[PDB]
């Protein structure tokens, strides 16, 4: 049936998690290792818009201490 | 008749795929993709296959020899069934590069075969060391598999039968320089260009390629059955 | 920007025949049409129509022999800033007169055979190959 618009598993095989928002910690940790750093966008099969915009939103999130900045912080 | 068009669709609803690449020069017979799978335009292909089958009927009386080329592992058995008799030659264990241009050399290697088999079955080269007999037994086997269904062919064939162009493009090139009328079934990455009748098709789905082959053989061969009786009666007026 | 629009006309015909296209359509002019009229009657194009009330537009069909091209190129000689003029006595010979020169004379646009038969001179527009 028409207009269902983003039920599940639909638009993309890997879901876009955020766009440019960074205030929830859990959407951000969707692509952040236990070492405390981003997985490459070729590996994740993420959509480019959300990733390009994440490069600003993660630097932001590290700077507001929602995330570890650095390997030393375990 | 409208039956030829009904065959084309029964076979064609695999639509091929070959991912989203395709080849721009086939585009008029190509519908736009359904989520990163190529999908063909089938309505513009059904006239084609019927026009080619009406032309096949007419060459039955002009020809002595068909060569079935564009064979591959899944479709070879289907080519065996399409020749039916020795007015139809076929290659089903791969074509080899220069088989028409250098037919000359194949016909010398055919002369080696019918000899070396009648020597084998006689028992004739198996003496001395095992090496001298075996290097001949093994080669006799490579030749026998390659040539068995084209072995009697006395000269360059009267038409050319393509079911797939993907590795056998060269057989089509050489045939056109020898001035032979070409009957093609071309896949989605092949071009429709440069041959005398084409059916636009696709190379995938073993159920489609089987139906294309069953259809070609009937139009040429029962036109041919009628021709042979006619020819005796045509020849006899001269001797009278 | 559009500094010669007859160079674009000829370039539209040239890519027409080379890419084996059946028709080529474009914006129209009194000059484009007047060249096309000599080309129609000498069979250097096949036929054309003119349609567009708002702005005029020309659609034409290409030079053949059997159904694909037998003419290689059509090029302009008189052009912007390098206008070339020939006298009545000096009207050109293009592929020993198998080809045309389209020549705009004081009395309008015609082929080198009608300019010669007239005893007029003028501007030598474009030659066939």
């Amino acid at each position: 049936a028409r207009y269902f618009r983003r039920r599940k598993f639909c638009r993309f095989t890997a879901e876009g998690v955020q766009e440019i928002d960074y205030k929830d910690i859990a959407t951000l940790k969707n692509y952040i290792t236990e070492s405390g750093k981003i997985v490459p966008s070729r590996i994740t099969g993420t959509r480019a818009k959300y990733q390009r915009q994440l490069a600003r939103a993660i630097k932001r999130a590290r700077y507001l201490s929602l995330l570890p900045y650095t390997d030393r912080h375990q | 008749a409208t039956v030829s068009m009904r065959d084309m669709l029964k076979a064609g609803v695999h639509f091929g795929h070959q991912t989203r690449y395709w080849n721009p020069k086939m585009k008029p017979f190509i519908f736009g993709a359904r989520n990163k799978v190529h999908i063909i335009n089938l309505e513009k292909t059904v006239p084609m296959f019927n026009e080619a089958l009406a032309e096949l009927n007419k060459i039955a009386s002009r020809k002595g020899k068909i060569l079935f080329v564009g064979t591959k592992r899944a479709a070879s058995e289907a080519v065996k069934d399409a020749a039916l008799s020795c007015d139809q030659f076929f290659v089903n264990h791969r074509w080899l590069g220069g088989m028409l241009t250098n037919w000359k050399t194949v016909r010398q290697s055919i002369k080696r075969l019918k000899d070396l088999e009648t020597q084998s079955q006689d028992g004739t080269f198996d003496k001395l060391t095992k090496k001298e007999a075996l290097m001949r037994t093994r080669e006799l086997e490579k030749l026998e598999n390659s040539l068995g269904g084209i072995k009697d062919m006395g000269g360059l064939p009267d038409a050319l039968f393509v079911i797939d162009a993907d590795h056998e493009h060269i057989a089509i090139k050489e045939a056109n320089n020898l001035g032979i009328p070409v009957f093609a079934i071309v896949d989605t990455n092949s071009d429709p260009d440069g041959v005398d009748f084409v059916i636009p098709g696709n190379d995938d789905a073993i159920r489609a390629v089987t139906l294309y082959l069953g259809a070609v053989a009937a139009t040429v061969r029962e036109g041919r059955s009628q021709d042979l009786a006619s020819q005796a009666e045509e020849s006899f007026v001269e001797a009278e | 920007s559009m500094q010669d629009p007859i160079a674009d006309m000829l370039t539209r015909i040239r890519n027409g025949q080379a890419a084996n296209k059946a028709a080529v359509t474009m914006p129209s002019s009194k000059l484009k049409v007047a060249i096309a009229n000599v080309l129609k009657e000498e069979g250097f194009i096949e036929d054309f129509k003119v349609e567009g009330d708002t702005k005029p537009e020309l659609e034409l069909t290409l030079k053949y022999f059997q159904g694909k091209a037998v003419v290689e190129s059509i090029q302009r000689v008189s052009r912007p800033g390098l206008r070339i003029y020939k006298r009545k006595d000096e009207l050109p010979k293009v592929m020993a007169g198998l080809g045309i020169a389209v020549v705009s004379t004081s009395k309008g646009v015609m082929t080198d055979r009608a300019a010669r038969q007239a005893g007029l001179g003028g501007e030598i527009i474009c030659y066939v190959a």
Binding site: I20, K23, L64, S65, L67 | - | -
Partner: protein, 135 residues
């Protein structure tokens, strides 16, 4: 006007300073015809790595619109604020003022996982629970 999504955190012991400061900053936004489009208090949270020392800070997402002129004076005042440890404000382009990615996690904080203590009473006095001095 253009939209600037500010989020900030405040040093625990110094949190009693912000409840006075917030009511001038909001008057400088609505006095210029801007709006405060949510004002969400997050409660006390644990820093991952310290910022100006101490492992704790108290979280506010204000969610502003204001003209470009006014926010420039107001941000330079917040950054040289001793109470604020850090703030980040995100770009105008394609920016949301509704439908919070953290909407459930904000409610959870407030309901069940907060401090329930006097320095985070102050944080809510600068939060949605605004208590403010008369002007």
């Amino acid at each position: 006007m253009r939209h600037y999504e500010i989020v900030f955190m405040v040093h625990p012991d110094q949190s009693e300073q912000v409840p006075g400061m917030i009511e001038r900053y909001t008057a400088a936004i609505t006095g210029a015809e801007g709006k405060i489009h949510r004002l969400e208090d997050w409660g006390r949270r644990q820093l991952a790595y310290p910022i100006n020392k101490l492992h704790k800070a108290h979280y506010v997402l204000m969610n502003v619109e204001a003209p470009q002129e006014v926010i420039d004076e107001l941000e330079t005042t917040f950054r040289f604020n001793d109470a604020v440890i850090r703030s980040m404000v995100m770009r105008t382009k394609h920016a949301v003022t509704e439908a919070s990615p953290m909407v459930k996690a904000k409610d959870e904080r407030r309901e069940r996982r907060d401090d329930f203590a006097n320095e985070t009473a102050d944080d809510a006095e600068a939060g949605d629970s605004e208590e403010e001095e008369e002007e």
